[PDB]
Amino acid sequence: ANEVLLVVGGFGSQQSPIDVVEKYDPKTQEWSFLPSITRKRRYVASVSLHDRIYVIGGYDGRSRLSSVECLDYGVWYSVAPMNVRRGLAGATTLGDMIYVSGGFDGSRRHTSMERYDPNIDQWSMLGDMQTAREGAGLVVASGVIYCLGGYDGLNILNSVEKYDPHTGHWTNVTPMATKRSGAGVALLNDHIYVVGGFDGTAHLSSVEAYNIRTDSWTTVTSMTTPRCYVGATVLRGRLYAIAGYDGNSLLSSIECYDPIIDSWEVVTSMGTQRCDAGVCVLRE
């Protein structure tokens, strides 16, 4: 109810990382600027936690970053950095903490995951995944974290790993039908949706959804356009695919998937053009 979409950083039309922060209101369909981040960051991830926006790692065009900055939803300020420089990492929240896994530090793709406690402003290293992954999102469903696809430095991946906080271990679940890197991922009505990405040859408009109860993937109606390094978030029971790269140009549009009609609609074409930005939801 009155949630909005937030999009930060990424790769802009001047072919460099940017600092632009925008919010989109699906109801009014209006965009607006927020205060710019301090360091320009592409390949960056964002989460929201208790009316706080976090912008995590990324890449300034020179080095991969472990630094993190925060905005109270306003002025941006620096908090404790991660232990690993990470571009194109997955990021999510679970029980008042941030989890970040995988990524690329300019030399190695990571298996590692670490966790942020806002109560003490510290990042703690957790268990490694089985496969090193850049370009893989994180998604939480019912207390458990899923890391989907990505790229290990040699192959685009269709494998999916599951982290159980009760065991502290990663295990495997049934893989996606398509190898995907740079896809957007979100939970919608207890299904994990994976939109777009890159399969090694083509930039994808295809979409798959994972039924967690039955451990099975099924094909979903494709998006209006291919989108790689695209963000995905759910608002009011609908799935949004934000900006990205269609294989030719940067995109400024957001399209919205509605299960009632089982189709994708463009809901705006007026954002800044960008890809590998970070996205999250704000409760106003």
Binding site: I156, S181, G182, G197, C275
Partner: peptide
Amino acid sequence: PGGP
């Protein structure tokens, strides 16, 4: 890979 697949990016700009």
